[PDB]
Design a protein around this ligand. Sequence first.
Ligand code: 6FQ
Length: 236
Amino acid sequence: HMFSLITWNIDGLDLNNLSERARGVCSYLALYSPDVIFLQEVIPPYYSYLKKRSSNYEIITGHEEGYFTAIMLKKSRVKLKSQEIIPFPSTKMMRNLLCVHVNVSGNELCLMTSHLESTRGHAAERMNQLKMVLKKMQEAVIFAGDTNLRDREVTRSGGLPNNIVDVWEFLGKPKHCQYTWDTQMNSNLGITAACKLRFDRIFFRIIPRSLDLLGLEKLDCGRFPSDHWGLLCNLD
Ligand SMILES: N#Cc1ccc2cc3c(=O)[nH]c(=O)nc-3n(-c3cccc(-c4nnn[nH]4)c3)c2c1
């Protein structure tokens, strides 16, 4: 029938004006009203707002302390079958892989999210994190989350497998959503340098329809909802 999802690193560690940014993030989720949501970098206070505002979603957290990922499932349409938190081994940043087995319209496709290593120097540790993601996908599939991948690190990690495709590259490599982390346009960072990267990615095992950016409008306090852009992929 139809399907949608939203990946967004809400940047929950950035405590400044977070009460207003979280009211903007919710306002984006309310108008679009997706079926599945993949959030990264969520602090316990941030999880408290989404629990009270978005009352029609069954949230599954990846941890409890620090920051963690989160999956929100449209309770009216998506049914919970299973849920599991597979942690990364040699992770030095309190990071894990969050998978949830659901059933939408009678179809068996699981949902995954993660927040791979943020460190740029810890590239091999991130690439080893990438390999365990693709190895778990083939073992169950729609992955989505802050990957922090760049500079052909997917190539040097052995490349993507045949059964796993990237929704961006699969849609003819569209240009409007080429970069989810844009230090040029997004000025929540004050970075005088200009770099653009595609961090938030979406891997597929249903056919993806569209892909678009979220949170491009500055709020009333002059700051964006997040340093990352929100991703939105429709399907059928
Ligand atoms: N401020 C700033 C600032 C300006 C410019 C760049 C440019 C790049 C680039 O062309 N490729 C790349 O892969 N990463 C870049 N980072 C980056 C982004 C996140 C993290 C770390 C990082 N973490 N640890 N060391 N470096 C670097 C930048 C950061």
